[PDB]
Design a protein around this ligand. Structure first.
Ligand SMILES: CN(CCOc1ccc(C[C@H](Nc2ccccc2C(=O)c2ccccc2)C(=O)O)cc1)c1ccccn1
Ligand SMILES: CN(CCOc1ccc(C[C@H](Nc2ccccc2C(=O)c2ccccc2)C(=O)O)cc1)c1ccccn1
Lengths: 14, 263, 262, 18
């Protein structure tokens, strides 16, 4: 659930 | 294997060059007058700050607060660049996205401070893409607790810069940093550590070819990773002093996201 | 040049053996039942601490007893690390202020490094191998006391995965002590000269003693930053204890080490 | 007179001699 706790970094990634 | 390690070094250096507009090469060229760029404007006190706000880069604030917002602005752009760079590290984008996020979360500030060292000297730091040069003394003179933020970064930079690294070394070193298997919360440690061992081998060959006659440069550079961690830890503690005592110290959502439950 | 680096390694290993009564070799011998020394007493709950306590030599709540027993060990460990440091060539010729600074910053990192030698995933040897206290029991101590050892077990399980031996550890803890980035050093250069020679001996040591463990040298240098995070967290927990618990003065030598540490 | 050696009396005592 790390990615769900970091939506902005996730969006930068994908 | 030595030729693929050298190809990996070249790949990393090219992605570094595509990802970070202001390299160490250009910062050194600025700081030693070898460029054709005009010299930075030198900000060394309040009065020279006011003089060079006049000609070059009305929402009046606290100078200490303006410094705060400027460093946050650079930090957000640096995070975006480090993420772009990270995606080119071979193997990185095949890892479980949760681990990708965790490695970004823990490694970005360590890379920010590493690359910040490229723009610093004993007396100050280049700002605004080389257009200005803000002195250590001036940064140190902002009202408490704001005056305490940069001094540990200058200390670290003078020690890190004593290693005389170049952009080609630095690309592999920040890759090593990103692929750290000991980040809290990693799901799959093993593929991370597999990629990092190849990055480490490429870094060792790189430092040996690029800096013969600098004995044990590889070991000194690996030791700087611990300086980087202490700097991050202390910076987080100072931000929390700042968030507890000042008004409207709200960070950009991406930095909030990064510092949420960091250590 | 390789023979001088190997003589340095042998010198360091001999001083390690003279300075630390319980080596990793003997701790491994306890933990896999291979010694002829009697087995440790296993402390796993409140009642077994009292049952094995008579083998512990100490002169003067379970958690308070664990705290005291630990402090006693830490003070003896500082003394052993100081003797070892004294045998490092060049160390005792440095300006005593620097000798003091390097001890001050390095002792706990070495304590945690060598503590890993006495740990497996289920517990830690105490009192020179005479006892064995389980991880679950330390984790079950009333807060904040239950939180002290658990991060060390985490580190130890990863550090022991490097399968270092006493001969590796002697050079690695020497490297640790001679760290040029200790805050407050007056002359960094002789320090860094000694450390570069220690580093060369460590690199040759790991290459001969652990071929087929690629980049072991770099993995071991990364553990130094692991040690630093461990020290930082331990200091924060000590301040929970000093702020919340009643009468928990540290031994004056540990107070001396932590005063104005970072 | 005032330096790190003086601020660490017991460490200093341990470090001397041998
Ligand atoms: C001195 N300097 C370059 C330093 O740039 C960075 C310096 C530090 C950082 C790390 C980044 N820092 C901040 C992020 C948000 C808000 C403040 C800061 C500060 O760090 C800060 C706080 C108070 C006073 C001074 C700094 C981070 O934590 O994410 C990222 C970039 C600049 C740059 C632009 C404008 C003014 N001068
Ligand atoms: C676990 N162990 C082996 C020693 O391990 C060490 C674990 C840590 C240390 C470092 C030392 N820590 C302490 C210092 C004073 C009092 C307690 C501690 C603890 O560490 C502690 C505190 C509260 C609860 C649990 C532990 C230091 O910081 O100086 C030195 C040694 C024991 C335990 C009991 C008796 C003897 N052997």
């Amino acid at each position: 659930d790390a990615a769900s706790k970091h939506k902005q970094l996730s969006e930068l990634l994908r | 294997e030595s030729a693929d390690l050298r190809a990996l070094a070249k790949h990393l250096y090219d992605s570094y060059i595509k990802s970070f507009p202001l390299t160490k090469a250009k910062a050194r060229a600025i700081l030693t007058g070898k460029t054709t760029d005009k010299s930075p404007f030198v900000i060394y006190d309040m009065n020279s700050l006011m003089m060079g706000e006049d000609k070059i880069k009305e929402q009046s604030k606290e100078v200490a607060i303006r410094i705060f917002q400027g460093c946050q602005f650079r930090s957000v752009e640096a995070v975006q660049e480090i993420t772009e760079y990270a995606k080119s590290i071979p193997g990185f984008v095949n890892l479980d996205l949760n681990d990708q996020v965790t490695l970004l979360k823990y490694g970005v500030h360590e890379i920010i401070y590493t690359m910040l060292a490229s723009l610093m000297n004993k007396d100050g730091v280049l700002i605004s893409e080389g257009q200005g040069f803000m002195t250590r003394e001036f940064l140190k003179s902002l009202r408490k607790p704001f005056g305490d933020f940069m001094e540990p970064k200058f200390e670290f930079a003078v020690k890190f810069n004593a290693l005389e690294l170049d952009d080609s070394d630095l690309a592999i070193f920040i890759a090593v940093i990103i692929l750290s298997g000991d980040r809290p919360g990693l799901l799959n440690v093993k593929p991370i550590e597999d990629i990092q061992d190849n990055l480490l081998q490429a870094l060792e060959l790189q430092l040996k070819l690029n800096h013969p006659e600098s004995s044990q440069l590889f070991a000194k550079l690996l030791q700087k990773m611990t300086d980087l961690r202490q700097i991050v830890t202390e910076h987080v503690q100072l931000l929390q002093v700042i968030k507890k005592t000042e008004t409207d110290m709200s960070l950009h959502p991406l930095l909030q996201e990064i510092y949420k439950d960091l250590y």
